[model samples]
Target: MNIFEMLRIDEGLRLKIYKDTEGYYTIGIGHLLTKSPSLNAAKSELDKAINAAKSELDKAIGGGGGGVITKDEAEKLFNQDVDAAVRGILRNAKLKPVYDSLDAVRRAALINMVFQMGETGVAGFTNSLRMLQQKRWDEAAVNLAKSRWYNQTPNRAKRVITTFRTGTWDAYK
Candidate 1:
């Protein structure tokens, strides 16, 4: 399926979760979300608590750490990412209509590509995107496959070309 093309683009097919950048907690392709009190806010709290501490009755406690997710968790994250990428992709008003006109599978392929490459990378495909916007499917696919992305990840990029031409989904194995 075209969704296969969508996911196989990943450098390596990984069912297990893993970290992406730094030592941050992450899973799926590159998904992670964690929030704590702002540094300043936490500092204020610490200062306030420092004075409030009754050493006669207690000590002190502090904590900071990170973790990784399981393959099951990553699968869920993958689903959420699909929705996020799809919605975000179609919301680009400049080409929202053009995206809207695509089949869901085709949309998924584009979202998968954009999600990984980011809009900045996509911007480099000016001619290809233009061809897509103008409804020149194969031409857009051809042009897209002739770029840096294709050269760097030829197998996966070839899948993208197939997806673009066929407007289908082929999930990674």
Candidate 2:
């Protein structure tokens, strides 16, 4: 599966704003409204989306009349978010080499992790990253499973861990 398709499934589309597992304001495939820069950059597009989907905005989760976006707008945001995730992974001094050492499928799995948790969050998985860099797939998967993310989103984490272990898209497919 392609990156966008995989993320669309993993993240799940949310045209309307909602509270994520952590209670952060989010919209459109995990775009965090609490993130100032992301929200600032998206202002005009968000306004347009909100305007276009005003009637649907009330469907938003966690109340406060959270706004909505179109699927096309959501796609645009998803692309930007994915690109940011990739750049964030590449920008890390330690993680950069780890990312570079992986095959395409494994690399995609890494990007997916960064996309979900952000680079800083993923950086906390030092042991797992170390195991991944050393090609110790099973050990890496075990380390990944020993995390709050695994508890919060067990199924998605399982798929990602399996992808990392197998170095294939079969888990995603």
Candidate 3:
């Protein structure tokens, strides 16, 4: 499956502010409001959104999101985040070789992983990345399956590993 479709399932759609697993303020398809550089870019519009929520939890998140964001707005932010993720993956010098060796679907899977966890986070999978570079698909998948990410989001991890192993869209579909 394509990156967008896979991420839509993995991240899910959200129109309002919510707290993520780590208690970070998040919005619009997994956008981490507190840490996002993109947040500054959307400050004016996002400020309006912040005032939209009145819940104590929403207010307690450092005056974080509880306000509504339109579907179009969410889509805009999602696209930007995905673009940044893809660019970061491509720009990583060590990952360049491994990324180039992958097929399109496999590449999409790699990008999906980076999207969920950022470049530094995925860099923790040193063995998996090495195995991937060596075209040892099963080993790489197994390495990924051994991580906390797999425990936290088993289904998404399984589907991504399946995509990496099989080099097909079936798992995503």
Candidate 4:
């Protein structure tokens, strides 16, 4: 599973995906995945995200594109995008310290959340992060639930919060 597969693109979705990603350079949802001031920049950023995801998958699975894998392998490949997205978000967010503190599963969930909701989603979760830092699980969960993202992608947000609250990776699995 490469970027194309992870995005679940058909011909139309592929076209739309390319169009959406073409030439925007920013971290977060609306910026990275949407059109921006410069088409080239947006496209470049999108390409970087896609390539980064591909590279990580290759490294993990010991294969490049144009190969077949088991369902588990495919899922793992897909999660590479999640990981890449997390890195991208961290880079764009300029929050290396915050990112370094994350486990793989937490990172994966954060990436998925950011990809769906954008950087602002994470920005809005400042209190949640603070809660986590303070080990305030219930308060962190409440803060997680306060975001607009929670309304849009309840399951995704729930999974991330679950990981944050429990130090468990099962939610993403």
Candidate 5:
């Protein structure tokens, strides 16, 4: 069995961030850490796993994806890709000013949402994004809470909205 499967058997799959016995941050079947881990890391890991699994599945059938890969490889690739995505968002012309105004936690709240929702999902917030760009915190928070995302995850949304409404980072803390 692959290391990931072995680890899964031992660690179980945890999609959400949690702590290990050593107090290190971790997620996804023994994936562990001390410093912060990225949400896109999970996405990229899942994507590669899907691709590789499908390849094996194809060989089981007739012909299809031979795009095989392992978990560590997927993890490495995810870091690279997620880094680029974060960089792009940080440097985004539209949100740069807004981004520059916030502290790290609030900055991370917005970025974390972007990672969770994807840039396309974030782009859907036309008015909210605009208000954010304009530094209209109240309207931006209102617009954010008005969305389906806020409804879907009220606490997470509330924290992000709080960060938006207030300069302090209250959400993740």
Candidate 6:
């Protein structure tokens, strides 16, 4: 399923999934709960999760929510968070030098993937990034394809690897 579908969203609600105070493109679980008439109690629980997620992201990126932020601002914040998250992952995984050599788009994709999957997944990609740094395009692609994330989210993995190999953000197929 597409991201929107997985999130249990339609086009109208999709548009409302703006960035949160910490800069993630988050749709309030509260909102979703409210939308589902049978989930009245879910509203409060979802709110808690959203708050916790934002807090965790903010702590990782060094910021706090100043109430609800606009979509554009949130996008910028999310980008910043992505960068910070990438740096954190690289440092923790001992891949900082290798990650630094990647192109901007490829780095962004990698960071976003790491953010979604966490440090262990990021560490698992050490060989892949090493191959990419050495400009071994086919080998890097193969290494990326071997990831558990690739198995679970094949399209996203393919898109990232293709972008890395071609040095083109539009290389996704």
Best of the candidates, lDDT: 2
- For model 1, residues 1-173, the per-residue Cα lDDT tens digits are 44533463563334433433333333455553322324344334333333343324666533222233345545555666667666666666544655777777666667767766665566567787777777788998889877988887677677767777776544343
Model 3, which residues run further than 4 Å from truth? 35-45, 48-66
Reference-based TM-score, model 2: 0.80
Rank ordering of all candidates by TM-score, starting from the highest: 2, 3, 1, 6, 5, 4
- Which 10 residues in a row give candidate 6 its minimum summed lDDT? 3-12
Better of 1 and 6 by lDDT: 1
Better of 1 and 4 by TM-score: 1
Task: Report the alpha-carbon TM-score of model 3 versus the true structure.
Answer: 0.79
Indicate whether candidate 1 or candidate 6 has the larger TM-score.
1
In model 6, state the lDDT of residue 167.
66
Any idea what lDDT model 4 has?
A: 0.52
lDDT of 2: 0.82
lDDT for 126 (candidate 5) = 79
Separate clash counts for every candidate = 11, 0, 1, 9, 0, 0
- Per-residue accuracy of model 4 over 82-127 as CA lDDT, tens digit each: 5666666767554344556766545544555565555665756777
lDDT of each: 0.58, 0.82, 0.79, 0.52, 0.58, 0.53
**Candidate 5 lDDT, 66-147, residue by residue in tens:** 3333455445544543555467676666555656776664566566566545566776687988787677889999988989
C-alpha TM-scores of all predictions: 0.61, 0.80, 0.79, 0.48, 0.52, 0.56
Candidate 4 C-alpha error for residue 66, in Å: 19
Worst 10 residues of 4 by lDDT: 9-18
After superposition on all C-alphas, the RMSD of every candidate to the true structure, in Å, is 9.7, 7.0, 7.5, 9.4, 12.2, 9.4
